[PDB]
Amino acid sequence: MSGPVPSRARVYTDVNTHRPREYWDYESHVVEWGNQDDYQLVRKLGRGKYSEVFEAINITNNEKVVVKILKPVKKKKIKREIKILENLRGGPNIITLADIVKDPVSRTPALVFEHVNNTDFKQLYQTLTDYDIRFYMYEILKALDYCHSMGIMHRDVKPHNVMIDHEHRKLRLIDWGLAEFYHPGQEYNVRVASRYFKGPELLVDYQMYDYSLDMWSLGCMLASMIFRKEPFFHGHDNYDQLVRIAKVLGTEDLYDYIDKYNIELDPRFNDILGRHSRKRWERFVHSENQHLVSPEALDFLDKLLRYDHQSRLTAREAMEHPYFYTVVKDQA
Ligand SMILES: O=C(O)Cc1ccn(-c2cncc(-n3ncc4ccc(NC5CCCC5)cc43)n2)c1
């Protein structure tokens, strides 16, 4: 019919605009390799369609490390993750890229990260207490506010990509293989993030999104922690994914959302979105999650999970929510 309405990030809108071209132009980035003979695989940690991750050891100092062996994908796709990890290196709660080597066997680039004595999230989350959830969520806001202020969107926030060393209260945001630099006006691929954490802007096919996409994904994790239902929105596919959301936030705000951005809703939604009222977060409270739920917890979640990305809270604003007052404000 007509065209979608443009959009711009409310914050960090032109951070790359004013930075040295080399900073964001990863394509012309020239990788400097290290000595792969330096590391040895010790155990498989998991895989994916773009890589296989392992636990390794630096043979020269016995230091434990994690090696991500890539799979053919395009130099551009490779340089992008490398450029990003180096621009963020040192950032709060950002996994650290220790090295970059040429894997002889696979003949593809293998990245070496700092290793974190992680505790399976599927088990860790069942033991987390109210303070912990607030605490880790806060640590994730740091990395989120840092990468955002550095002009980068993660695009794949989820438990799986958050490493935690519980005894040491240490958290790191990993896997920036889908991370991209943010340029106002640009139209991105919506085929990013993982189903359960995909934002309505992705489910509705709106391309001019921004960092606010990570806030929704982050909202999805919060909900699954305080309610002890992981994942929270269990869609069967991308279309059903939106349906599940609709069934909680209600269909009215959803339609207010596409009307506003004059989005062309895929026909396949007509027959499945239905008509649902916005449910109250209390409907998800029970005798097993009550201790983890509070007004500040719901008010916060409420400000993270909204159709209009623009209305979502920015990581920086979120760090200011009463829900984090306690979080032993370092001070020292
Ligand atoms: O940054 C990256 O993408 C790789 C990357 C860089 C830092 N890591 C990293 C660092 N320390 C520990 C782990 N562990 N430890 C146990 C474990 C179990 C599973 C996984 N899954 C991996 C994360 C997604 C699937 C593979 C990691 C796991 N991973 C990973």
Give the list of residues 6+ apart from residue 273 with CB closer than 8 angstroms, or none. 242, 243, 246, 251, 254
- The gap from C-alpha 127 to its chain's centroid, in whole angstroms, comes to 22
List, chain by chain if needed, residues with CB within 6 Å of any ligand 1 atom. 45-46, 48, 53, 66, 68, 95, 113, 115-116, 118, 160, 163, 174-175
Q: Is 49 annotated as a binding residue?
A: yes
Q: Which amino acid is at 268?
A: R
The dihedral through the CA atoms of 178, 15, 188, 276 has a sign that is: positive
Which one is the CATH code of 25-115: 3.30.70.940, 3.40.50.1370, 1.25.40.80, 3.30.200.20? 3.30.200.20
How buried is residue 107: exposed, middle or buried, by Cβ count under 10 Å (0-12/13-18/19+)? exposed
CA–CA separation, 303 and 313 (whole Å): 6
If you measure from the C-alpha of residue 118 to the centroid of ligand 1, how many angstroms do you get, rounded to a whole number? 8
The dihedral through the CA atoms of 244, 250, 252, 254 has a sign that is: negative
Closest CA to 210 of 21, 4, 7: 7
CA–CA separation, 300 and 206 (whole Å): 25
CA–CA separation, 203 and 241 (whole Å): 8
Q: Would you state the structure tokens that stand for residue 260, as one six-digit string?
A: 């506003």
Q: How many residues does the chain have?
A: 332
Residue 205 — φ and ψ, nearest 5°? 80, 30
Chain region(s) in the chain for CATH 3.30.200.20: 25-115
- Paired with 100 in beta bridges are 111
Angle at 191 between CA 307 and CA 152, to 5 degrees: 75
Give the C-alpha distances (Å, rounded to integers) separating 96 from 115, 174, 176: 9, 9, 11
Residue 97 CA neighbour count, 13 Å, CB half: 22
Q: Would you state the structure tokens that stand for residue 19, as one six-digit string?
A: 């930075």
If you measure from the C-alpha of residue 306 to the centroid of ligand 1, how many angstroms do you get, rounded to a whole number? 30
Torsion, Cα 178 22 141 135, to 10 degrees, reads 90
Residue 303 CA neighbour count, 13 Å, CB half: 16
Q: Is 47 annotated as a binding residue?
A: yes
Tell me if 114 sits within 8 A of 96, measured CB to CB.
yes
Method: X-ray
Resolution of this PDB entry, in A? 2.6
End-to-end CA distance of the chain: 58
State the CB neighbour count (10 A cutoff) for residue 47. 12
- Active site annotation includes 37: no
Atom 19 of ligand 1: nearest residue by CA position? 45
Chain region(s) in the chain for CATH 1.10.510.10: 7-24+116-331
Question: Which residue is associated with the tokens 């993750």?
Answer: 81
Q: Would you state the structure tokens that stand for residue 250, as one six-digit string?
A: 């209600």
Tell me if 130 sits within 8 A of 291, measured CB to CB.
yes
Q: Is 83 annotated as a binding residue?
A: no
Q: Of 145, 156, 210, 214, which one is the catalytic site residue? A: 156
CA–CA separation, 232 and 247 (whole Å): 12
Which of 39, 47, 66, 121 maximizes ligand 1 atoms within 8 Å of its Cβ, making it the mutation to test the pocket? 66
If you measure from the C-alpha of residue 161 to the centroid of ligand 1, how many angstroms do you get, rounded to a whole number? 7
Which of 50, 174, 176, 178 maximizes ligand 1 atoms within 8 Å of its Cβ, making it the mutation to test the pocket? 174
Which one is the CATH code of 7-24+116-331: 3.40.630.30, 1.10.510.10, 3.40.50.1820, 3.20.20.150? 1.10.510.10
Rg for the chain, CA atoms, rounded: 20
Which atom of ligand 1 sits closest to the CA of residue 116? 11
CA–CA separation, 99 and 291 (whole Å): 43
Q: Would you state the structure tokens that stand for residue 269, as one six-digit string?
A: 């939604």
If you measure from the C-alpha of residue 112 to the centroid of ligand 1, how many angstroms do you get, rounded to a whole number? 11
- The gap from C-alpha 273 to its chain's centroid, in whole angstroms, comes to 26
SS (H, E, C) the chain: CCCCCCCCCCCCCCCCCCCCHHHHCHHHCCCCCCCHHHEEEEEEEEECCCEEEEEEEECCCCEEEEEEEECCCCHHHHHHHHHHHHHHCCCCCECCEEEEEECCCCCCEEEEEECCCCCCHHHHHHHCCHHHHHHHHHHHHHHHHHHHHCCEECCCCCHHHEEEECCCCEEEECCCCCCEECCCCCCCCCCCCCHHHCCHHHHCCCCCCCCHHHHHHHHHHHHHHHCCCCCCCCCCCHHHHHHHHHHHHCHHHHHHHHHHCCCCCCHHHHHHHCCCCCCCHHHHCCCCCHHHCCHHHHHHHHHHCCCCHHHCCCHHHHCCCHHHCCCCCCCC
